[PDB]
Design a protein around this ligand. Structure first.
Ligand SMILES: OC[C@H]1O[C@H](O[C@H]2[C@H](O)[C@@H](O)[C@H](OCCCCCCC3CCCCC3)O[C@@H]2CO)[C@H](O)[C@@H](O)[C@@H]1O
Ligand SMILES: *C(=O)/C=C/N[C@@H](C(=O)O)[C@](C)(COC(=O)CCCC(=O)O)S(=O)O
Length: 258
C-alpha cells in the first residue's frame, strides 16, 4: 500500500467523492494525519456513540440508571429495530438500549435514548458543554448542515468522552466496551486485521454514498489511536465504499510509525 495521505487521495479519485479523515493519539490528542478534517460530513449512525456519552453523563450525575427498564410500544418503533423489536413484551434497560444503538445501530433504541437526553437540542447542548461547537444533531444533499460533524470535531469529542474527566471511570470504561462489542463491522474488521491489532468502532451509512467509521486502532493489542473516516457525495456501491475505507486502513497499518 502507499502512504496514508496518498491512499486517501486515491480513494477520492476512485470514488469521485469527498473523504474526511483524522488519525489521532488517544492518550494525548496528537494529530498524525488530517485530510479535510475541518470540512462537514453527515454523521449518520456514528452519532450513536456521542448520544450514549450523554446518557452516561446523566448516569454519573445521578439523573439516570443503566438498570432502568424502559417499556415501549410497537407504534414507537422506527425503521431498523433488530434488537428493540424483540422486546415489546419485556422492555429494555437504558444500558441495553445503548448496547443496541452502538453495537447493532438499532434506530428505535437510539430514538428512545435521544428522548432521555432532551432530543437533538439536548444532545447539541451537551456537545456545546464539552467544547464541541461544530457537531450538530437536528433530527442528504450538499449544503445541508443538519446531523453533521467534522473529522477533527468528532475525534476530539470521542477523545473527551473516553479519556477526559467528563465521564466517570466506570462510564468511560462502559463507552469503550460498547465500541469493542460492535456487531455491524467489528467481527468483519478483525477477520481482515493482522494479528495483534486492536479494534473498536462505530459505523455509519447514508444517502449519496455517505459512509463512515469512528474507530480505535493500534498494534500490540492497544487502543493507540482514534481514526475517523467519513465519505460523502460518491455514487459508488456500498462494497466499493467499504473497500476504499479498508484501503486507507491498510495504508495506516503498513505505515504506522509516524
Ligand atoms: O505490515 C505488513 C502487514 O500487512 C498485511 O496486512 C494487511 C491485511 O492482510 C489486510 O487484510 C488489511 O486490510 C485492511 C483492513 C482494515 C479494516 C478496516 C480498518 C478500519 C479501522 C480504523 C478506522 C478505519 C479503517 O491490510 C493489511 C495491511 O496491508 C499482512 O497480511 C500482514 O501479515 C502484515 O502484518
Ligand atoms: C446508521 O448509519 C444507519 C444507517 N442506515 C440505516 C438507516 O438509515 O437507518 C439503514 C436502515 C441501514 O442500516 C444498516 O444497514 C445497519 C448498519 C448501519 C451502520 O453502519 O451503522 S438504511 O437502509 O440505510
Amino acid at each position: 500500500s502507499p502512504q496514508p495521505l496518498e491512499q486517501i487521495k486515491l480513494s477520492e479519485s476512485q470514488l469521485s467523492g469527498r473523504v474526511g479523515m483524522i488519525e489521532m493519539d488517544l492518550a494525548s490528542g496528537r494529530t498524525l494525519t488530517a485530510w479535510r478534517a475541518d470540512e462537514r460530513f453527515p454523521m449518520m449512525s456514528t452519532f450513536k456513540v456521542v448520544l450514549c456519552g450523554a446518557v452516561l453523563a446523566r448516569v454519573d450525575a445521578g439523573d439516570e440508571q443503566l438498570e432502568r427498564k424502559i417499556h415501549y410500544r410497537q407504534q414507537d418503533l422506527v425503521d431498523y429495530s433488530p434488537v428493540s423489536e424483540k422486546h415489546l413484551a419485556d422492555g429494555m434497560t437504558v444500558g441495553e438500549l445503548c448496547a443496541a444503538a452502538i453495537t447493532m445501530s438499532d434506530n428505535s433504541a437510539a430514538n428512545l435514548l435521544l428522548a432521555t437526553v432532551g432530543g437533538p437540542a439536548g444532545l447539541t447542548a451537551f456537545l456545546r458543554q464539552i467544547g464541541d461547537n461544530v457537531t450538530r444533531l437536528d433530527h442528504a444533499l450538499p449544503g445541508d448542515a443538519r446531523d453533521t460533524t467534522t473529522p477533527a470535531s468528532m475525534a476530539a469529542t470521542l477523545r473527551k468522552l473516553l479519556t477526559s474527566q467528563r465521564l466517570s471511570a466506570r462510564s468511560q470504561r462502559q463507552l469503550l466496551q460498547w465500541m469493542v462489542d460492535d456487531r455491524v463491522a467489528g467481527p468483519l474488521i478483525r477477520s481482515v486485521l493482522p494479528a495483534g491489532w486492536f479494534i473498536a468502532d462505530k459505523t455509519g451509512a447514508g444517502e449519496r454514498g455517505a459512509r463512515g467509521i469512528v474507530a480505535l486502532l493500534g498494534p500490540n493489542n492497544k487502543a493507540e489511536r482514534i481514526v475517523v473516516i467519513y465519505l460523502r457525495d460518491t455514487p459508488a456501491s456500498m462494497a466499493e465504499r467499504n473497500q476504499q475505507i479498508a484501503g486507507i486502513g491498510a495504508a495506516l497499518i503498513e505505515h504506522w510509525q509516524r
